[PDB]
Amino acid sequence: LEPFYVERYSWSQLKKLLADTRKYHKAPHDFMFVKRNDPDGPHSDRIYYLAMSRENTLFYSEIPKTINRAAVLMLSWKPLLDLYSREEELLRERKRIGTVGIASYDYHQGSGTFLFQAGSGIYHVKDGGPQGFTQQPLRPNLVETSCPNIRMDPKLCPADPDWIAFIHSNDIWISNIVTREERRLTYVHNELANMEEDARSAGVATFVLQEEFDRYSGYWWCPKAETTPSGGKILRILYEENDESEVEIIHVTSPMLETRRADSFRYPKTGTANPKVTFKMSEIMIDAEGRIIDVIDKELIQPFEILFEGVEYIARAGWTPEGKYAWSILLDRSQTRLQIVLISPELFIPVEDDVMERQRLIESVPDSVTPLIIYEETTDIWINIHDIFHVFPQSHEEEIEFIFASECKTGFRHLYKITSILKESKYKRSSGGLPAPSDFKCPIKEEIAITSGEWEVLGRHGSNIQVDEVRRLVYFEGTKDSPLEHHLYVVSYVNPGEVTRLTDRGYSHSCCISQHCDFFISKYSNQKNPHCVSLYKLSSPEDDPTCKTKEFWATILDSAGPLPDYTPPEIFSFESTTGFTLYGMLYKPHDLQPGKKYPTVLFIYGGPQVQLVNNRFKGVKYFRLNTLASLGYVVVVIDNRGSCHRGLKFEGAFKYKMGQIEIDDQVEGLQYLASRYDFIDLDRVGIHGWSYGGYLSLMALMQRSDIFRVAIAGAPVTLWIFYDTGYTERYMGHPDQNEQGYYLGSVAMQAEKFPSEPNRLLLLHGFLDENVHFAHTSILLSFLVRAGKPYDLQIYPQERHSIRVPESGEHYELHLLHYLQENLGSRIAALKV
Amino acid sequence: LEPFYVERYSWSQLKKLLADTRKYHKAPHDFMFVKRNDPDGPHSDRIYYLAMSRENTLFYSEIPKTINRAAVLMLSWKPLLDLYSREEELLRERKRIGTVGIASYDYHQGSGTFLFQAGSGIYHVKDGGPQGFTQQPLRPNLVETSCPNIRMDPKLCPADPDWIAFIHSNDIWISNIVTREERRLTYVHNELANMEEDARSAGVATFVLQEEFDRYSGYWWCPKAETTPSGGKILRILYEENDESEVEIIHVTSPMLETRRADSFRYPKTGTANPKVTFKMSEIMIDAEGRIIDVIDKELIQPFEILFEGVEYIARAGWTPEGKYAWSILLDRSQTRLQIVLISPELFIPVEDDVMERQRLIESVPDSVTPLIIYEETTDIWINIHDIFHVFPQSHEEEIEFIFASECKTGFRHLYKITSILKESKYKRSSGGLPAPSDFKCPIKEEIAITSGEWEVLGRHGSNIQVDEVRRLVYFEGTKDSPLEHHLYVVSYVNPGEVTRLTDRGYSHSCCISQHCDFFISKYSNQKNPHCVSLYKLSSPEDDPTCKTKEFWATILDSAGPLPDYTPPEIFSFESTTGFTLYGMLYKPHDLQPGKKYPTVLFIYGGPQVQLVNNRFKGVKYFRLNTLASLGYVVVVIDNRGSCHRGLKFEGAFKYKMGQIEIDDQVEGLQYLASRYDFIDLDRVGIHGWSYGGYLSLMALMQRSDIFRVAIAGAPVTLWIFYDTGYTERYMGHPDQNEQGYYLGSVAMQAEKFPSEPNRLLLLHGFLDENVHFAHTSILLSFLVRAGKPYDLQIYPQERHSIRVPESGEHYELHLLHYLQENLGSRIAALKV
């Protein structure tokens, strides 16, 4: 063969090319179905959703009772409405929200009350309650406040839509939107105090639980209100209280660089103490008229450590829908033992200073009342937290039924219907001892598996189940038809068997089912077609309600249609020497000259909880992998072992071994291609990735000087001893029980292994990164300098983990092309060597 | 004219080249003469001095009463002795100490008591006092303490050498070194309280005073002790007391990168508040036994803003020889108004909590007693502070004679013998008003200029004046013979005639004159010969005491001989279009070729207070400029207008106009060289400097995008609003009244002016730099990314403003050479364009 050299564009010509290709180019979400219940009118439902017009607001569309099955009905988007703090900027990093405006909302089917934060303000309108359905945009009603700082995480009370709660300065507040009454429920954080002195918070999820467990709230309204004798009621808020006094303090640069100051930050470094956590409960007494009689604040009868021995993370929490028990999913620190636990409000006593008054209240509580561990699972690998957990109405007082999902039985996540016996505990507090390990555990009456197979149910990033308690069905999202396509399925939970698919093959679907289970919405795409949102109607043959079929109904969002100037990559697979099928994407270069070999650029992530290779449209996010092909680079992407959507066995492959397996799969796939395509120049191969991808880019250059000419590492994790507990320990365990794994997985501990030629290493970092701190890069550079190695370095001083400012994104793309051109593809590059 | 191209060495090759040449390659200082008074012994004096054996410690040599004039005598060095915290590490950055061991020392003439810090320890020995002279090394006596943290800045009481003082946690302590008694004199700083809430100090110079006024001390012993009736005595200490509570707080990265924390410290940013400062005095009453009886603390009778209207910085301070008055040099904030001031101890009243006893104490002090301004000068350029100031024993008790130095009168710094009348002031505290700005001023009886001419007396960086009161002479260093050589001069202060030069021309000398004025020591070098140190004997014909002659006496340190593998540069000069002569240094590329033109690297500083071109040995400091010449680069260095040693008009050139002029001079001299020598390729010129030098490198690349191919900016000031008060306001003035100056002199405010070609800009910065904070670089990167301009960046995370870690230095030289080779010198560099 004969080497292809990429054209040598100037920095200003490359800026032009990139700007011209970009000169062209968020879909609906948070859907809600509301019945009109109007016989005379032509509309059966009204659907509300968030979407970009620009800013992000509530829209609505009208679901008609029938359709012209000749034509395609495209629903019109009626606008519903007529319109950053260091708390807003940090939360919108933890959720990975790129949008601006309304991020989420809250609704009360009874009242028709919408409640939503929008900038610094909290608003509320009504629609679809007794007050009817607007035919034009509504003007929102601002909630009044005496509070001086931004109100975070507003929630409607499900039992009373006059009452909302919110967090201000790390304490829970309630406000009545009709009576204008306002009230602070917790006095845990002085806002005037400094960081080190206070370090306490109520109703807020701590950093680790937003970053690594995607849980953002830490208080939960009780769904039912209890009546006082004189025609009032009691409302309940369960909340987690946090004390981060032992948690290590990090400083990270304040975005306003002019100040030259840093922001204090609680970061549980791997090995260090996580925050101290316990449950609490506010009892709020309301009189008949809707004003606050009194607010009792209640603590657990015994300490948290005693009742929930071994629990470190409060992964999830809420209420049974009866309002009877507060439930919670709890992990041990190793993230190998998960427990579902019911907690009676009778476990909470009022907080008292008097030692003799508490011992009085303690005596009042009976020994029968005790935490109930309705479920427990263990794994030699790790427990992946998900959002799937459905509690049924209680038939007998002494059983609870529920659906949960687990990778622990099969090696693959499946739904399971479980009945638990609510036995009274062996243990009595009377004895005055610390309860045994299995003293609170409930017997398992039945454990019916609703699904099974060499495929998994999805329960993260908004994937979930939807139970039809009438037809005794459960809709879920799965990889049953393929690992590269997510599809909607339905199945009986009473007598499970056949698993009916509802989405059409050849597309990967993100799905949302009406609360009435008579409609669903699919956001679907494939490698060649950009995302469409469509609305399908569910009906059953009248001989068997257990059986469900779909009928396309109306389009909510039409695709722009196979984008021109974009050549999609072709998916491939190959059998590993490890006995797994690995999948990849190949961007062949545009205008393929026969008799020529091209420089190959391997883009990588390779970390857990992620899959790059699937049948989705990569034209939006990975448009620049296409642009590289248009300049005459081969671009390769390989989902190596540890990637998600392949079962726990596949994922657990790098437990304790991070950075020691992923590249051997990247190279195995990179060679399977070279053997099959003589147009791949293995002498000019570069690797680029961000975050975990940037990590492996550096491992690629240490482990394999031979294969990879240049590594471009963005926000790389150079030192696992610095990452947080929630993530690092899930995969690497405590650094005492993996001395060697932490050493071999930390690229900064191994700077001598880097090349002694320049123009091979390029390091990129967000200067204000609060997730992968900039000290990963600053400490690797320190050891490269000692080892007399050379590096190239671009800092993005306004950026954090993600790149938000576009000027930054443009510079990153411009530099990356120029760098690959100057140090890989072009003629001048081969001369430099 | 054929282009020469430098041999493209690899990164590993270039590292070897440097390590090989680096494989090849401190003189004595702090000299002090003690007379032996041995009429029968062969030795007249014994000199004590600090030098490197290895550690830096005290040595002595013997001065012969007589010498064989036929031969040279080389004095053998006898060792006198028998063998970092955060605040000791910052002091060494402010002083710019590289050496380890003993930095300075004290000596009580009467007792023979030495006193010196060495690491954490404080030690004393005796030699040359009543107790005679050691023939063998003495053992250092540790001053014991109860003080937890390290002790900074020890000083011997001259009025009793049993007592010493020192600073501990920003308070003044005294310790008797025979009774081991240890007393704390000030209670202004809580070591355990956080620095944000404390920010008060006593006896310490604040940051700007150490950085910009090279004053490293804030307390002063009274040099005589008043006697008591019982037979004890009163010792006194004058001390500056600062409050940094209103001074902006900055965060620099902690050097322990593992912690990912930042150290808070107080930085007076241009235009913000300098610390509130005042004078105080500690009266220590000691008994006849030597035990402390009592300690009264005393404040000024009126606030510092009243007694010293206008004074922003206390520049220097101390006591007159009898200790009748304490004196102080005082600047206004614009540093255009120097005042000298006498403050009687009688101005200080005991500090009393009672509001009514303090009133009885105020009236007790006479209204006659008042601050005495004995000298005031003003300039529309600015005041350069200096260590020259001499007060004569008082003859008339209403007059005071002294010697000061000033550029204000003639435009060059010259000595002046001044008598001032101490007329009791008109202002009275009884009247109870504030004084007019002229009320403490003093009539000026005479003012005889001792020197004059277009050349300056030197009074910075250890240059000072020795004063023979017996013969009424004053020895001083000056630029009279040339700007490129410093020389030792002597002249009468009674009948100031002509100026006898004592040093030999053809060399540049730093000098040090026996307190007896019968000897002097010169450390001297020239462009070709490394620094020597010789001892000369002063002699006068018995007919005329003014006539002064020298005679070589002994070698203290022999030259290392002319170094091989080092060609020196040749000094040049050129008439500027501005009218001034400018000097330069040319390193011709070793092994010149006929007809061939070579790549050129201009090393630059160009800031004030510094001259790079002079007749001193550059073989140590600028060794690598010659290493650049040995590879093929022409190397050029020019002292543009602003640089020191050429008078106040030459310096004042860039008042308010920093950045706007300097490069015109650098390019003028570059073109002068290009006309006379045709080997200077002007199509291949790089510029490189550190700090101000890196600043001008960035200005050269904006302003002259045509003359300069690459710029390599080290630790460069990019935003004058960020730099400190005492420096920026001295030249650029307050920012709100020179708004255009600050804009035009700030490269980051002009990022659009930078090239759009890559491989032309290199930013180098110490990550922990606390002087030119790394925000200068990060904010400039901020604006360069916005503007879409390319840059190369290198960080040194171990280093602050200097480069101390040897591995950081090796990597800097190696990158600097490779970047020059790959982007300026070689043929591949010509292909890149």
mmCIF file of C-alpha atoms in Angstrom, chain B residues 58-300:
data_model
loop_
_atom_site.group_PDB
_atom_site.id
_atom_site.type_symbol
_atom_site.label_atom_id
_atom_site.label_comp_id
_atom_site.label_asym_id
_atom_site.label_seq_id
_atom_site.Cartn_x
_atom_site.Cartn_y
_atom_site.Cartn_z
ATOM 1 C CA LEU B 58 30.573 31.889 59.524
ATOM 2 C CA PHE B 59 34.364 31.874 58.830
ATOM 3 C CA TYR B 60 37.231 34.112 60.071
ATOM 4 C CA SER B 61 40.614 35.050 58.519
ATOM 5 C CA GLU B 62 43.618 36.819 60.141
ATOM 6 C CA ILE B 63 44.822 40.208 58.762
ATOM 7 C CA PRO B 64 48.653 40.462 59.002
ATOM 8 C CA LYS B 65 50.064 43.647 60.644
ATOM 9 C CA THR B 66 52.557 43.585 57.705
ATOM 10 C CA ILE B 67 53.054 41.761 54.335
ATOM 11 C CA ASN B 68 55.896 40.652 52.029
ATOM 12 C CA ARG B 69 55.064 42.900 49.008
ATOM 13 C CA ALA B 70 57.075 40.597 46.637
ATOM 14 C CA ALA B 71 54.450 37.778 46.846
ATOM 15 C CA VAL B 72 50.599 37.443 47.014
ATOM 16 C CA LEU B 73 49.008 36.343 50.349
ATOM 17 C CA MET B 74 45.856 34.114 50.158
ATOM 18 C CA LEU B 75 44.069 34.234 53.579
ATOM 19 C CA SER B 76 43.209 30.694 54.831
ATOM 20 C CA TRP B 77 39.524 30.430 55.973
ATOM 21 C CA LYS B 78 39.183 29.189 59.601
ATOM 22 C CA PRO B 79 35.683 27.786 60.355
ATOM 23 C CA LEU B 80 34.231 29.712 63.368
ATOM 24 C CA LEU B 81 31.665 26.947 64.103
ATOM 25 C CA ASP B 82 31.603 23.240 65.146
ATOM 26 C CA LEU B 83 29.324 21.054 62.920
ATOM 27 C CA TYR B 84 11.452 24.864 56.042
ATOM 28 C CA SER B 85 8.237 26.219 57.677
ATOM 29 C CA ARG B 86 5.668 28.113 55.496
ATOM 30 C CA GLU B 87 6.854 31.531 56.877
ATOM 31 C CA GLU B 88 10.624 30.759 56.472
ATOM 32 C CA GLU B 89 9.928 29.602 52.838
ATOM 33 C CA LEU B 90 8.036 32.873 51.976
ATOM 34 C CA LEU B 91 10.820 35.061 53.559
ATOM 35 C CA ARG B 92 13.392 33.291 51.277
ATOM 36 C CA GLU B 93 11.200 34.072 48.189
ATOM 37 C CA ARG B 94 10.875 37.782 49.262
ATOM 38 C CA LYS B 95 14.659 38.073 50.036
ATOM 39 C CA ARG B 96 15.411 35.802 46.978
ATOM 40 C CA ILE B 97 17.784 33.587 49.094
ATOM 41 C CA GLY B 98 19.010 30.466 47.220
ATOM 42 C CA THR B 99 21.552 29.335 49.864
ATOM 43 C CA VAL B 100 20.967 27.029 52.909
ATOM 44 C CA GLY B 101 22.418 27.575 56.434
ATOM 45 C CA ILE B 102 23.148 31.026 57.980
ATOM 46 C CA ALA B 103 21.651 33.903 55.906
ATOM 47 C CA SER B 104 22.640 36.845 58.210
ATOM 48 C CA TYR B 105 24.070 37.442 61.740
ATOM 49 C CA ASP B 106 24.433 40.103 64.505
ATOM 50 C CA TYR B 107 27.524 41.169 66.514
ATOM 51 C CA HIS B 108 27.670 43.213 69.756
ATOM 52 C CA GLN B 109 31.001 45.134 69.415
ATOM 53 C CA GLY B 110 31.397 45.341 73.243
ATOM 54 C CA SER B 111 30.807 41.671 74.230
ATOM 55 C CA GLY B 112 31.867 39.707 71.092
ATOM 56 C CA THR B 113 28.365 38.096 71.043
ATOM 57 C CA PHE B 114 27.365 36.723 67.608
ATOM 58 C CA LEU B 115 23.638 35.877 67.183
ATOM 59 C CA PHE B 116 22.262 33.994 64.125
ATOM 60 C CA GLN B 117 19.271 31.869 63.031
ATOM 61 C CA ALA B 118 20.183 28.536 61.337
ATOM 62 C CA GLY B 119 17.214 26.387 60.295
ATOM 63 C CA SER B 120 14.642 26.595 63.146
ATOM 64 C CA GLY B 121 17.413 27.124 65.746
ATOM 65 C CA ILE B 122 18.692 30.461 67.145
ATOM 66 C CA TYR B 123 22.356 30.333 68.309
ATOM 67 C CA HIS B 124 25.065 32.576 69.852
ATOM 68 C CA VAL B 125 28.894 32.385 70.226
ATOM 69 C CA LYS B 126 31.426 34.920 71.649
ATOM 70 C CA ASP B 127 34.649 35.942 69.820
ATOM 71 C CA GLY B 128 36.771 39.153 69.783
ATOM 72 C CA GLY B 129 35.158 40.706 72.906
ATOM 73 C CA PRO B 130 36.879 41.108 76.316
ATOM 74 C CA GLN B 131 37.213 37.268 76.240
ATOM 75 C CA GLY B 132 39.723 37.251 73.325
ATOM 76 C CA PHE B 133 39.994 35.202 70.106
ATOM 77 C CA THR B 134 39.411 31.445 69.495
ATOM 78 C CA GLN B 135 42.180 29.501 67.663
ATOM 79 C CA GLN B 136 39.729 26.550 67.161
ATOM 80 C CA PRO B 137 36.051 26.317 66.011
ATOM 81 C CA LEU B 138 33.475 27.471 68.651
ATOM 82 C CA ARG B 139 30.304 25.443 69.452
ATOM 83 C CA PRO B 140 26.933 27.149 68.708
ATOM 84 C CA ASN B 141 24.864 27.800 71.901
ATOM 85 C CA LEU B 142 21.131 27.112 71.211
ATOM 86 C CA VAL B 143 18.815 29.854 72.610
ATOM 87 C CA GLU B 144 16.219 27.547 74.284
ATOM 88 C CA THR B 145 12.457 28.388 74.098
ATOM 89 C CA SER B 146 8.929 27.325 75.201
ATOM 90 C CA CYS B 147 7.519 28.802 71.927
ATOM 91 C CA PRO B 148 5.626 26.098 69.936
ATOM 92 C CA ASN B 149 6.124 27.257 66.273
ATOM 93 C CA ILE B 150 9.386 28.489 64.590
ATOM 94 C CA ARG B 151 11.027 31.839 65.583
ATOM 95 C CA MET B 152 11.716 34.414 62.788
ATOM 96 C CA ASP B 153 14.000 37.521 62.681
ATOM 97 C CA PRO B 154 16.252 37.374 65.797
ATOM 98 C CA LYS B 155 18.062 40.625 66.826
ATOM 99 C CA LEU B 156 20.569 41.348 69.659
ATOM 100 C CA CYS B 157 19.738 44.266 71.982
ATOM 101 C CA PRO B 158 22.740 46.632 71.503
ATOM 102 C CA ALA B 159 22.075 48.165 74.980
ATOM 103 C CA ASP B 160 22.502 44.708 76.681
ATOM 104 C CA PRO B 161 23.712 41.635 74.687
ATOM 105 C CA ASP B 162 22.215 39.155 77.222
ATOM 106 C CA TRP B 163 18.756 40.143 75.813
ATOM 107 C CA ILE B 164 17.534 39.257 72.262
ATOM 108 C CA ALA B 165 14.159 39.698 70.494
ATOM 109 C CA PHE B 166 12.383 37.627 67.803
ATOM 110 C CA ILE B 167 8.954 37.170 66.143
ATOM 111 C CA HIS B 168 6.679 34.185 66.989
ATOM 112 C CA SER B 169 3.176 33.960 65.390
ATOM 113 C CA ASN B 170 3.291 37.718 64.484
ATOM 114 C CA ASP B 171 4.107 38.928 68.042
ATOM 115 C CA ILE B 172 7.430 40.222 69.487
ATOM 116 C CA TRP B 173 9.160 38.016 72.116
ATOM 117 C CA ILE B 174 12.318 38.753 74.160
ATOM 118 C CA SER B 175 14.609 36.054 75.641
ATOM 119 C CA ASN B 176 17.611 36.521 78.018
ATOM 120 C CA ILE B 177 20.407 34.111 76.892
ATOM 121 C CA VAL B 178 21.926 33.625 80.403
ATOM 122 C CA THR B 179 18.831 33.701 82.728
ATOM 123 C CA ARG B 180 16.848 31.779 80.012
ATOM 124 C CA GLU B 181 13.922 34.120 80.938
ATOM 125 C CA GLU B 182 11.472 34.420 77.986
ATOM 126 C CA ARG B 183 8.738 37.120 77.778
ATOM 127 C CA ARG B 184 6.043 37.850 75.144
ATOM 128 C CA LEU B 185 5.842 41.661 74.536
ATOM 129 C CA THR B 186 2.773 41.838 72.184
ATOM 130 C CA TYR B 187 -0.625 40.016 72.283
ATOM 131 C CA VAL B 188 -1.942 41.100 68.839
ATOM 132 C CA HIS B 189 -2.188 37.725 66.975
ATOM 133 C CA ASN B 190 -4.028 34.507 68.015
ATOM 134 C CA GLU B 191 -1.959 31.704 66.336
ATOM 135 C CA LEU B 192 -4.942 29.273 66.768
ATOM 136 C CA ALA B 193 -7.569 31.676 65.234
ATOM 137 C CA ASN B 194 -8.080 31.518 61.404
ATOM 138 C CA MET B 195 -6.145 34.112 59.310
ATOM 139 C CA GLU B 196 -9.406 35.475 57.731
ATOM 140 C CA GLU B 197 -10.697 36.567 61.206
ATOM 141 C CA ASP B 198 -7.258 37.593 62.669
ATOM 142 C CA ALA B 199 -4.985 39.453 60.135
ATOM 143 C CA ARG B 200 -3.058 41.503 62.765
ATOM 144 C CA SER B 201 0.742 41.536 63.365
ATOM 145 C CA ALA B 202 3.451 43.324 65.429
ATOM 146 C CA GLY B 203 7.203 43.587 64.634
ATOM 147 C CA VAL B 204 6.749 42.182 61.074
ATOM 148 C CA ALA B 205 7.007 43.767 57.601
ATOM 149 C CA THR B 206 3.823 43.063 55.518
ATOM 150 C CA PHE B 207 4.052 41.482 52.012
ATOM 151 C CA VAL B 208 4.418 44.704 49.899
ATOM 152 C CA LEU B 209 7.140 46.081 52.253
ATOM 153 C CA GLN B 210 9.209 42.866 51.760
ATOM 154 C CA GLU B 211 8.457 42.486 48.012
ATOM 155 C CA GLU B 212 8.594 46.127 46.775
ATOM 156 C CA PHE B 213 10.574 48.077 49.457
ATOM 157 C CA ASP B 214 13.057 45.261 50.378
ATOM 158 C CA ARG B 215 12.410 45.876 54.117
ATOM 159 C CA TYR B 216 12.223 42.490 55.922
ATOM 160 C CA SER B 217 11.807 43.740 59.543
ATOM 161 C CA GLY B 218 9.216 45.689 61.613
ATOM 162 C CA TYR B 219 10.900 46.156 65.041
ATOM 163 C CA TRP B 220 14.065 48.006 66.209
ATOM 164 C CA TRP B 221 16.020 47.887 69.523
ATOM 165 C CA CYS B 222 16.752 51.251 71.180
ATOM 166 C CA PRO B 223 20.607 51.206 71.159
ATOM 167 C CA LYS B 224 21.121 52.805 74.644
ATOM 168 C CA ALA B 225 19.397 51.822 77.950
ATOM 169 C CA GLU B 226 18.022 54.476 80.396
ATOM 170 C CA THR B 227 19.093 53.763 84.057
ATOM 171 C CA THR B 228 16.647 53.413 87.042
ATOM 172 C CA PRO B 229 17.000 54.682 90.667
ATOM 173 C CA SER B 230 17.220 51.069 92.035
ATOM 174 C CA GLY B 231 20.165 50.195 89.690
ATOM 175 C CA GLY B 232 18.214 48.415 86.897
ATOM 176 C CA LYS B 233 17.455 49.907 83.427
ATOM 177 C CA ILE B 234 14.694 50.513 80.798
ATOM 178 C CA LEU B 235 15.250 48.803 77.406
ATOM 179 C CA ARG B 236 13.032 50.039 74.517
ATOM 180 C CA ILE B 237 11.775 48.467 71.230
ATOM 181 C CA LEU B 238 10.126 50.551 68.453
ATOM 182 C CA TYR B 239 7.873 48.321 66.268
ATOM 183 C CA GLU B 240 5.440 48.704 63.316
ATOM 184 C CA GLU B 241 1.949 47.257 64.085
ATOM 185 C CA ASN B 242 -0.115 46.340 60.961
ATOM 186 C CA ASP B 243 -3.827 45.426 60.532
ATOM 187 C CA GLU B 244 -4.519 43.580 57.221
ATOM 188 C CA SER B 245 -8.291 43.209 58.015
ATOM 189 C CA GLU B 246 -9.363 45.377 55.011
ATOM 190 C CA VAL B 247 -6.702 43.922 52.604
ATOM 191 C CA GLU B 248 -8.072 41.708 49.768
ATOM 192 C CA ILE B 249 -7.574 37.935 50.386
ATOM 193 C CA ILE B 250 -6.135 35.754 47.564
ATOM 194 C CA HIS B 251 -5.767 31.910 47.406
ATOM 195 C CA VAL B 252 -2.530 30.343 46.004
ATOM 196 C CA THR B 253 -2.410 26.518 45.517
ATOM 197 C CA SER B 254 -0.824 24.599 48.448
ATOM 198 C CA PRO B 255 2.512 23.045 47.286
ATOM 199 C CA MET B 256 1.298 19.677 48.689
ATOM 200 C CA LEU B 257 -0.791 19.060 45.503
ATOM 201 C CA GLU B 258 -2.138 15.827 47.150
ATOM 202 C CA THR B 259 -4.312 17.937 49.536
ATOM 203 C CA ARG B 260 -5.943 19.932 46.646
ATOM 204 C CA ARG B 261 -6.216 22.868 49.114
ATOM 205 C CA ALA B 262 -5.155 26.544 48.772
ATOM 206 C CA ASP B 263 -3.312 28.846 51.236
ATOM 207 C CA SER B 264 -5.105 32.167 51.963
ATOM 208 C CA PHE B 265 -2.758 35.212 51.992
ATOM 209 C CA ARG B 266 -3.285 39.039 51.921
ATOM 210 C CA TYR B 267 -2.414 40.720 48.547
ATOM 211 C CA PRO B 268 -2.859 44.526 48.199
ATOM 212 C CA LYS B 269 -4.085 44.527 44.541
ATOM 213 C CA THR B 270 -3.459 47.847 42.661
ATOM 214 C CA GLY B 271 -6.027 50.440 43.841
ATOM 215 C CA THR B 272 -7.279 48.369 46.842
ATOM 216 C CA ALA B 273 -6.416 49.000 50.543
ATOM 217 C CA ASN B 274 -2.843 48.655 51.908
ATOM 218 C CA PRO B 275 -2.738 47.467 55.576
ATOM 219 C CA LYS B 276 -3.527 50.039 58.344
ATOM 220 C CA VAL B 277 -0.137 50.620 60.103
ATOM 221 C CA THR B 278 1.106 52.542 63.200
ATOM 222 C CA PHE B 279 4.199 52.883 65.462
ATOM 223 C CA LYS B 280 4.225 51.413 69.024
ATOM 224 C CA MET B 281 6.938 51.030 71.724
ATOM 225 C CA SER B 282 7.594 48.363 74.413
ATOM 226 C CA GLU B 283 9.282 49.720 77.590
ATOM 227 C CA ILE B 284 10.933 46.689 79.313
ATOM 228 C CA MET B 285 11.940 47.483 82.962
ATOM 229 C CA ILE B 286 14.834 45.156 84.079
ATOM 230 C CA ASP B 287 16.156 44.858 87.702
ATOM 231 C CA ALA B 288 19.840 45.001 88.813
ATOM 232 C CA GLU B 289 19.744 41.133 88.928
ATOM 233 C CA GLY B 290 18.794 41.055 85.182
ATOM 234 C CA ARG B 291 15.237 39.696 85.805
ATOM 235 C CA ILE B 292 12.306 41.464 84.010
ATOM 236 C CA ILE B 293 10.521 43.748 86.543
ATOM 237 C CA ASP B 294 7.621 44.956 84.308
ATOM 238 C CA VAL B 295 6.679 45.558 80.605
ATOM 239 C CA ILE B 296 4.656 48.705 79.646
ATOM 240 C CA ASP B 297 3.235 48.771 76.060
ATOM 241 C CA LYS B 298 2.904 52.315 74.568
ATOM 242 C CA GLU B 299 0.945 53.828 71.607
ATOM 243 C CA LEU B 300 1.393 57.231 69.834
#
